[PDB]
Write a protein that binds this ligand. Structure first.
Ligand SMILES: CCCCCCCC/C=C/CCCCCCCC(=O)O[C@@H](COC(=O)CCCCCCCCCCCCCCC)COP(=O)([O-])OCC[N+](C)(C)C
Ligand SMILES: CCCCCCCC/C=C/CCCCCCCC(=O)O[C@@H](COC(=O)CCCCCCCCCCCCCCC)COP(=O)([O-])OCC[N+](C)(C)C
Ligand SMILES: CCCCCCCC/C=C/CCCCCCCC(=O)O[C@@H](COC(=O)CCCCCCCCCCCCCCC)COP(=O)([O-])OCC[N+](C)(C)C
Ligand SMILES: CCCCCCCC/C=C\CCCCCCCC(=O)O[C@@H](COC(=O)CCCCCCCCCCCCCCC)COP(=O)([O-])OCC[N+](C)(C)C
Ligand SMILES: CCCCCCCC/C=C\CCCCCCCC(=O)O[C@@H](COC(=O)CCCCCCCCCCCCCCC)COP(=O)([O-])OCC[N+](C)(C)C
Ligand SMILES: CCCCCCCC/C=C\CCCCCCCC(=O)O[C@@H](COC(=O)CCCCCCCCCCCCCCC)COP(=O)([O-])OCC[N+](C)(C)C
Ligand SMILES: CCCCCCCC/C=C\CCCCCCCC(=O)O[C@@H](COC(=O)CCCCCCCCCCCCCCC)COP(=O)([O-])OCC[N+](C)(C)C
Ligand SMILES: CCCCCCCC/C=C\CCCCCCCC(=O)O[C@@H](COC(=O)CCCCCCCCCCCCCCC)COP(=O)([O-])OCC[N+](C)(C)C
Ligand SMILES: CCCCCCCC/C=C\CCCCCCCC(=O)O[C@@H](COC(=O)CCCCCCCCCCCCCCC)COP(=O)([O-])OCC[N+](C)(C)C
Ligand SMILES: CCCCCCCC/C=C\CCCCCCCC(=O)O[C@@H](COC(=O)CCCCCCCCCCCCCCC)COP(=O)([O-])OCC[N+](C)(C)C
Ligand SMILES: C[C@@H]1CC[C@@]2(OC1)O[C@H]1C[C@H]3[C@@H]4CC=C5C[C@@H](OCCC(CO)CO)CC[C@]5(C)[C@H]4CC[C@]3(C)[C@H]1[C@@H]2C
Ligand SMILES: C[C@@H]1CC[C@@]2(OC1)O[C@H]1C[C@H]3[C@@H]4CC=C5C[C@@H](OCCC(CO)CO)CC[C@]5(C)[C@H]4CC[C@]3(C)[C@H]1[C@@H]2C
Ligand SMILES: CC(C)CCC[C@@H](C)[C@H]1CC[C@H]2[C@@H]3CC=C4C[C@@H](O)CC[C@]4(C)[C@H]3CC[C@]12C
Lengths: 1105, 82, 91, 92
């Protein structure tokens, strides 16, 4: 039946008839009134049962004999006469009301339903997730009433306490009592608002009026919400979400749940509270207006299986408030003022008519309650003690169970209540044995609760002695808490795509993940030789810089709020932020690449750009203090980060606001010059000094002091250590600015010669010009091979895919390959000697050169793209050409729309021919450029140049061409121009940042090239080869300076953090909504005082009364 | 609707038919034009509005091949019957 | 509209009912008037159906797609998508 | 020290703050022993260490290694003499 409720759980049927209150009366013949009102000790009529076996008494007489000795009549028991016979009330209520529906669920069941299946109904069947708190509400069972202040404050606190701990409120489920007032408070407070306070009412079935409506299988239970006061029995309060209804087998009887309700709570405080945490779910109990049984059940908690605290509030009603009285006037041991029982027994007889000897018993038991007042909690709502019932509720479960302060934190940690922990658990004079703090931190980190981590870090914890290898290895490999599906995929690939089905994660295999995420030739400290051994082998396992290893964790597991927090702590702030940007950015790519079950990449994209801006804002700060030191920060080896550099890391992430920041730019300019002081020299003096070397010794060079911030080579460092002449030439020819204008001049002289060769005739053998051309291209090629093999990546297949990912490197490959095809044909041809251009192998060779040369003119746009003013226009041209594809397809369609009808009308006797392919494109294309072929349009006109193709239909071709040019020349060309106009505006908006970012790869290229240009470069290769066969820039800082840099780090690391808060406090509209927050305490307190001012003035005249 | 009313037992055919055909309160001059067209552009001068003739208005307003539950076979009969 | 069920469907019908009356006013062109008032009423309900789609999509993408294509059975065995195309409700 | 904490006196600012204490008492003095180092003062508020926890807000800690431990009053004159030779130099 797929209805586990129907199957395992069951109802109760009165299957026997025992006349109750059988008092024969009106309407003289017996049977009629013996058939009118003969109730049973079950509670129903014999005619209201009928029950397929109780109908057998409607017809004859009550299911028994006649008189049927009254020694035997009394003997009902649901144990004896009641058959179970599955439930018929497992529907769902649709409580009608406000602009919503207050939907809720229910079930019928017996008072002896097992405590485990009722759990297997709440959690398994109803999907309801196990709580971290229960609020067992035990107050008034009649329609009690309260005043406005308590109506709001008590409401918020009870609600909020359930919000924080995801609690399960428990009531009777009946809107005569607590449930009415419990449920109400949820209504106004908007607890529903993107939120649920799980709320349950254990009621009995028989009473709830319109129970017969709820009868039936799974249905939208049309509970009618009639507030008709004729139905005393009850109206189910329409806010409680769930209604377990004890079908004990009685109707009109009461108290079917009193044990079950408790047993459910007993087997709610008997399961774990999030397995990382080991504790039973704590259970508070509250008291509203309340009766003499409501105080009685307080004695069923204080002296009960694991002691259940009590949160009697102050000011509610008769019970909840009176228990404050006996609390207040009586000592910690419940020591009464001896005239208490001589004047409280008036209070009982004042509040109740419970009696006198009865009342004596009440206070006596009520002190038997108050024998232990370390465990109850009077919420003094007047005088504002705990300032919401909440803080008293939660505190009440952290005091009176002889629990340890670790056992007190660990619960607060589970609840998301730091405020409870900092204010109560972290109280003056506390014990905290040895690793309690440490065990909480392994719990707080895996559970992703920064606010407790933050607190613990302030309250004695140190990450230095707490990051051991088993521990942090644990902290990686936990699916408890916010879990990443991506890391398990990342470990898959690096582990050959082979998982042991269990596969505990090591620190080692993670190191290969980072080396894949950071890319290039990064080497994590988890894959090194020393670490890899001591790991297997395993005091020394305390990780010299732990806050570096946790920042990796928080980012590999998408725990941003932990990452961003931990980043604040420790040192190497700017570096950690540029790694994080790289880690997230790569995972944000591998999501979009792997494209599996995984998702959530734009979330990672945002996380990278979050840390990216942090590194930029630290650069700003550090640069506004000392420009020179900031440059040194961009270039010191890190040594915890694979001996990399903060700049190098930011280029890997393509983090442009950092590379386009004026600090890097001023440094990029200083590496461009080398030891040349170009603020004093000029680029025309560099060109002159290349062509006239003696001017090299006339230029203004630099010292060591104004070169100390610049990353230098081993040589450029050393040659300055030990300003003579030979060192003045070494400074010039090794500067990147010189290697540019020395390759540029050779390249321009290359094109001048190569232009001369294609324009001047070729005899059999090459001329000196053509040999010098071939020499350039040959060595230029070797130069390009080297800068692939000597790239930065390590995998040759990735050294390759990056280099071929640039336009001008692809073009050079084609230009170099196409040249030697041409040389091979030009040179390997058998010369004719009657005419050069009769041998078609020689011609093909020459014609490849004359097209080859176009590649080499266009390579000059790459030299021009170096200039700040020209480069934006080279970017445009590429974006224009790349993205105009679809306009040009339309243009080619419009073209054939015209070219095919024209050729068909004008040339109607054409066999198939290759000319037909030319003649449908040729003239229509030159029209695009405004050539209308004026004397060819009308071919039958007297001034025609085509008088012979006059014939039938040819008069159609002017009309065709008139339409064509309007569409082509006016619409389509200016649509393309309109596109290009928007490209222009887009590029100019971004052109300067992109130019600044591309200076890096540019300048670093001309820091690695040889000092000789491509014809003479071969000597530099030779010398730089037989060196290696026989046998880059680093900021060299002495320890005295290396020290002060770290001092300049921390000082600027510091001043940044302080600043952000200070500006952020001020705000603009923040301040206005901080005002509005303050508009309440005024209005409340202008009503506080304004409430008393009427209380003041009544006094004054009463004192003069 | 909050104080004991339920629209489920309160929407009977004479009632909701009444609630259509009342010029008491904010009145539409458009619906009476819509009922004109679907009724062949012929009005009895009195012409009480049914639920039926409304169904042909919706089928004209929703367009295409929409079929209101007021023009169906079952409904059209029980209406006359009731 | 707030009350009951089939909220997204009721909003895309309403957009269609008002939009057609907003046309037949401008078509019939008689003593009647007040069409741009109807035009606004359609776009009011139209945005309601869009904002329910947003909500329903940010919870489970797959179920939201099923909501656009289940037969309604109180609405001439039509579909919330099909209804929104009739109103030319582009968002 | 506390008052500096909440008020955000650090915020782009420093109130220069100094504590003349004695060396022998300050618990985990043996930690601070050693040449120029990032002194890992552990900040343990363990009340077993009556001797004292150095308040963590004071920026500077001159510590009178008089040659006693557990004794008190090594600074009472020095602290003053420093102040005497602070009120003995010019003020710009
Ligand atoms: C990752 C790297 C990035 C950078 C890219 C770098 C890679 C660049 C890659 C470049 C590849 C270039 C391929 C050239 C192929 C020539 C084909 C051809 O047409 O041959 C012709 C000559 O063939 C001969 O063998 C005779 C000519 C002498 C050799 C000149 C070509 C080789 C130069 C190579 C220098 C390599 C340069 C690179 C050096 C490093 C065949 O025709 P024929 O014999 O004339 O016809 C005879 C007909 N008849 C008898 C009727 C007359
Ligand atoms: C990426 C951009 C565009 C898309 C790419 C693809 C473009 C498509 C490209 C199509 C090319 C057209 C087909 C050429 C083949 C036929 C030529 C031939 O064999 O015969 C002709 C010679 O031909 C020539 O001498 C060359 C003529 C080429 C004209 C191309 C430029 C016009 C514009 C095109 C650009 C339009 C682009 C539209 C954009 C709005 C003559 O015929 P025959 O039989 O040799 O006659 C011999 C006798 N005779 C000596 C007296 C003559
Ligand atoms: C605005 C200025 C224009 C005046 C307006 C009034 C329209 C005036 C038009 C009047 C139509 C009558 C003129 C053609 C009569 C035959 C004459 C002739 O020689 O025809 C020649 C061609 O042309 C044709 O054979 C037919 C041309 C029809 C084009 C008119 C289209 C409608 C113009 C818009 C309508 C207007 C209203 C709508 C506007 C919105 C015959 O051939 P051929 O080219 O000499 O050469 C072929 C070979 N042959 C030499 C061996 C023969
Ligand atoms: C690779 C590009 C780099 C930039 C440009 C480099 C070169 C710039 C320098 C000069 C450009 C011009 C070259 C000389 C042309 C000589 C002309 C000739 O054929 O014979 C002549 C003399 O010839 C000699 O005296 C032979 C010279 C030996 C080779 C010199 C190589 C030096 C450059 C090695 C490279 C490293 C240097 C640069 C390092 C940055 C006589 O003249 P002609 O014949 O009556 O006149 C020619 C006209 N004709 C064709 C109609 C007949
Ligand atoms: C005469 C014959 C003339 C032209 C023939 C066609 C030339 C190649 C076509 C251009 C595109 C191309 O292949 O690009 C590849 C060159 O990969 C190579 O292998 C280039 C080899 C050139 C010879 C590189 O692709 P990519 O640009 O790395 O990948 C695109 C995406 N990305 C840029 C975002 C990474
Ligand atoms: C002797 C003379 C005879 C020989 C003449 C030979 C003729 C000349 C042949 C060709 C021109 C020479 C250069 C090659 C073209 C550039 C490649 C390119 O775009 O690379 C780029 C992308 O790369 C890719 O996107 C890879 C796939 C190519 C894209 C499609 C267009 C090119 C294909 C062929 C179409 C034309 C057919 C030509 C091929 C047969 C890499 O550069 P980038 O800086 O990263 O910018 C890319 C940015 N983007 C990816 C976002 C867009
Ligand atoms: C990637 C590498 C691609 C290319 C590899 C190498 C390919 C090797 C290619 C060619 C080598 C073949 C040598 C000759 C073969 C026999 C024919 C012969 O000798 O003569 C014939 C030559 O006929 C021709 O067509 C010659 C031109 C062919 C080359 C076309 C360009 C290919 C390169 C594109 C650029 C690629 C750029 C790619 C860049 C990435 C005729 O000449 P004849 O004998 O004087 O005439 C006799 C008839 N008569 C009596 C009427 C006069
Ligand atoms: C034989 C004729 C050859 C000359 C051509 C004459 C025509 C006019 C030509 C060119 C004007 C540009 C030259 C002066 C630029 C100096 C400043 C500058 O822009 O610096 C840039 C570098 O320099 C470049 O990027 C310039 C590129 C040089 C190659 C030119 C090839 C194209 C011209 C070939 C002809 C094709 C057209 C057809 C005409 C025949 C920026 O670098 P930087 O490190 O920032 O610079 C210093 C630092 N600072 C600037 C920050 C302070
Ligand atoms: C002999 C004849 C005369 C010679 C003409 C003169 C030589 C030609 C002149 C200019 C050549 C182009 C300059 C490149 C500038 C750099 C661009 C670059 O780096 O990337 C660009 C791609 O790059 C491309 O798309 C390359 C262009 C494709 C091949 C050019 C064909 C020209 C003819 C076709 C027209 C004929 C069609 C119709 C004909 C019938 C970037 O594009 P993006 O993706 O939008 O931006 C990403 C940014 N990124 C750079 C960071 C990646
Ligand atoms: C009369 C005007 C009527 C009024 C004008 C308005 C009406 C327009 C209608 C028609 C214009 C008039 C056509 C008459 C042509 C007369 C010339 C003739 O016979 O030419 C030739 C035949 O020509 C034909 O057979 C043409 C057949 C009609 C083509 C379809 C037109 C569709 C227009 C689509 C409409 C879309 C409009 C735009 C949409 C926005 C033959 O004579 P020839 O030229 O001397 O050739 C040499 C003869 N020889 C073999 C004996 C040597
Ligand atoms: C790109 C590179 C730029 C430099 C350069 O290479 C290319 O440019 C080349 C052009 C060459 C000259 C071209 C033609 C002549 C004329 C001839 O005499 C004619 C007859 C006379 C009778 O009275 C009337 O003029 C004498 C030789 C001369 C001057 C060449 C000399 C070498 C030159 C300068 C070459 C030089 C190495
Ligand atoms: C979607 C687009 C629609 C238009 C279009 O692109 C696709 O459709 C294409 C089909 C092409 C023709 C196919 C076959 C031939 C036969 C050949 O005959 C041999 C020559 C002879 C010499 O005498 C041998 O000896 C001559 C060329 C011709 C007619 C093609 C012309 C171009 C055409 C029209 C192309 C045109 C641009
Ligand atoms: C189809 C063949 C046989 C005929 C000739 C084809 C034409 C279109 C070829 C021959 C030479 C070619 C040029 C060679 C060099 C370059 C430089 C490159 O950076 C962009 C493309 C560009 C500008 C080419 C465009 C196309 C081109 C002009």
């Amino acid at each position: 039946q797929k209805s586990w409720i129907e199957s395992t759980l069951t109802k109760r049927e009165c299957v026997y008839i025992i006349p109750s209150s059988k008092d024969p009366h009106r309407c003289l013949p017996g049977c009629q009134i013996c058939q009118q009102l003969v109730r049973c000790f079950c509670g129903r009529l014999v005619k209201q049962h009928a029950c397929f076996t109780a109908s057998l008494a409607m017809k004859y007489s009550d299911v028994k004999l006649g008189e049927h000795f009254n020694q035997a009549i009394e003997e009902w028991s649901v144990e004896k006469h009641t058959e179970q016979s599955p439930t018929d009330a497992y529907g769902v209520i649709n409580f009608q009301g406000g602009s919503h529906s207050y939907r809720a669920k229910y079930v019928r069941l017996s008072y002896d339903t097992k405590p485990e299946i009722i759990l297997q109904l709440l959690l398994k069947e109803w999907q309801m997730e196990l709580p971290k708190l229960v609020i067992s509400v035990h107050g008034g069972m009649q329609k009690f009433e309260l005043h406005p202040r308590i109506k709001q404050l008590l409401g918020k606190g009870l609600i909020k306490a359930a919000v924080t701990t995801g609690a399960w409120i428990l009531t009777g489920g009946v809107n005569t009592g607590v449930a009415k007032h419990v449920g109400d408070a949820l209504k106004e407070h908007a607890s529903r608002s993107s939120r649920k306070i799980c709320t349950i009412g254990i009621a009995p079935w028989g009473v709830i009026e319109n129970r017969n409506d709820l009868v039936g299988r799974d249905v939208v239970a049309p509970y009618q919400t009639l507030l008709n006061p004729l139905s005393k029995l009850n109206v189910l309060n329409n806010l409680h979400s769930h209604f377990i209804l004890v079908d004990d087998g009685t109707v009109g009887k009461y108290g079917a749940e009193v044990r079950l309700r408790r047993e459910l709570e007993k087997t709610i405080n008997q399961q774990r509270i999030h397995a990382r945490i080991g504790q039973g779910v704590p259970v508070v109990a509250l008291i509203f207006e309340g009766g003499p049984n409501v105080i009685l059940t307080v004695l069923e908690y204080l002296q009960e299986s694991p002691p259940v605290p009590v949160v009697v509030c102050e000011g509610t009603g008769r019970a909840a408030d009176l228990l404050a009285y006996i609390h207040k006037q009586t000592e910690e041991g419940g020591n009464l003022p001896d005239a208490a029982e001589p004047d409280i027994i008036s209070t009982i007889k004042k509040t109740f008519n419970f009696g006198q000897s009865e009342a004596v018993h009440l206070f006596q038991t009520m002190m038997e309650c108050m024998k232990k007042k370390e465990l109850i909690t009077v919420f003094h709502i007047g005088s504002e003690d705990h300032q919401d019932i909440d803080v008293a509720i939660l505190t009440a479960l952290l005091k009176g169970t002889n629990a340890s302060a670790f056992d007190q934190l660990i619960l607060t940690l589970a609840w998301d209540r730091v405020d409870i922990a900092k204010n109560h658990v972290f109280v003056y004079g506390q014990q905290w044995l040895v690793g309690s703090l440490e065990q909480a931190m392994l719990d707080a980190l895996v559970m992703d609760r920064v606010s407790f981590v933050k607190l613990l870090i302030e309250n004695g914890v140190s990450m230095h002695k707490f990051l051991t290898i088993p521990r942090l290895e644990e902290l990686y490999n936990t699916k408890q808490g916010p879990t990443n599906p991506m890391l398990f995929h990342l470990i898959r690939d690096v582990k050959q795509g082979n998982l042991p089905p269990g596969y505990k994660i090591t620190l080692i295999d993670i190191g290969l993940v980072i080396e894949y995420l950071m890319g290039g030739t990064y080497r994590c400290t988890y894959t090194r030789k020393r670490f890899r051994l001591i790991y297997n082998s395993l005091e020394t396992k305390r990780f010299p810089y732990p806050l570096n290893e946790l920042l990796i964790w928080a980012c590999l597991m998408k725990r941003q709020v932990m990452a961003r927090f931990l980043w604040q702590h420790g040192e190497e702030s700017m570096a950690k932020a540029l790694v994080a940007c790289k880690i997230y950015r790569s995972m944000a790519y591998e999501a979009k690449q792997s494209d599996l079950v995984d998702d959530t990449s734009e979330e990672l994209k945002q996380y990278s750009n979050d840390f990216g801006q942090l590194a930029v804002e630290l650069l700003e700060q550090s640069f506004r203090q000392d420009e020179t030191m900031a440059m040194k920060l961009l270039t010191y080896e890190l040594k915890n980060w694979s001996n990399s550099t903060c700049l190098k890391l930011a280029v890997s992430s393509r983090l442009r606001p950092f590379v386009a920041h004026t600090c890097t730019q001023m440094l990029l300019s200083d590496m461009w010059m080398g030891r040349l002081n170009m603020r004093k020299n000029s680029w025309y003096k560099v060109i002159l000094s290349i062509l006239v070397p003696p001017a090299i010794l006339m230029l203004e060079y630099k010292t060591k002091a104004e070169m100390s911030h610049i990353p230098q080579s081993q040589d450029a460092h050393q040659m300055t250590m030990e300003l003579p002449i030979t060192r003045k030439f070494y400074a010039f020819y090794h500067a990147p600015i010189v290697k540019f204008w020395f390759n540029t001049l050779a390249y321009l002289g290359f094109l001048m010669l190569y232009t001369f060769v294609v324009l001047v005739k070729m005899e059999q053998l090459p001329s000196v010009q053509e040999w010098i051309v071939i020499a350039y291209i040959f060595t230029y090629a070797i130069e390009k091979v080297r800068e692939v093999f000597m790239s930065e990546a390590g995998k040759i297949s990735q050294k390759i895919k990056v280099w071929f990912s640039d336009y001008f490197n692809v073009s050079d490959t084609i230009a170099i390959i196409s040249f030697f095809v041409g040389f091979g044909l030009r040179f390997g041809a058998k010369w004719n000697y009657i005419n050069a251009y009769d041998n078609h192998v020689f011609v093909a060779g020459r014609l490849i050169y004359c097209l080859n040369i176009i590649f080499w003119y266009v390579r000059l746009l790459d030299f021009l793209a170096v200039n700040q003013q020209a480069g934006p226009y080279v970017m445009m041209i590429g974006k224009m050409v790349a993205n105009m594809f679809y306009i040009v397809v339309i243009m080619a369609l419009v073209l054939l729309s015209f070219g095919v009808p024209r050729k068909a009308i004008l040339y109607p006797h054409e066999e198939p021919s290759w000319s037909l392919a030319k003649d449908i494109v040729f003239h229509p294309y030159w029209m695009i450029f405004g050539e209308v072929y004026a004397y060819e349009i009308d071919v039958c006109a007297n001034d025609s140049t085509l008088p012979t193709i006059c014939g039938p239909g040819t008069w159609l071709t002017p009309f065709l061409q008139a339409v064509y040019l309007f569409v082509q020349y006016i619409i389509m060309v200016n649509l393309l121009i309109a596109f290009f106009n928007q490209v222009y505006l887009q590029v100019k908006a971004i052109s300067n940042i992109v130019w600044k970012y591309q200076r890096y790869h540019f300048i670093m290229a001309y820091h690695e090239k040889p000092v000789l240009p491509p014809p003479l470069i071969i000597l530099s290769h030779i010398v730089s080869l037989f060196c290696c066969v026989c046998k880059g820039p680093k900021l060299f800082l002495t320890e005295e300076d290396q020290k002060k840099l770290h001092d300049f780090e921390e000082q600027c690391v510091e001043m940044y953090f302080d600043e952000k808060d200070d500006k952020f406090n001020s705000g603009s509209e923040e301040r206005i909504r901080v005002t509005f927050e303050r508009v309440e305490q005024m209005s409340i307190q202008i009503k506080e005082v304004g409430d008393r001012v009427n209380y003041i003035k009544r006094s004054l005249q009463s004192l003069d009364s």
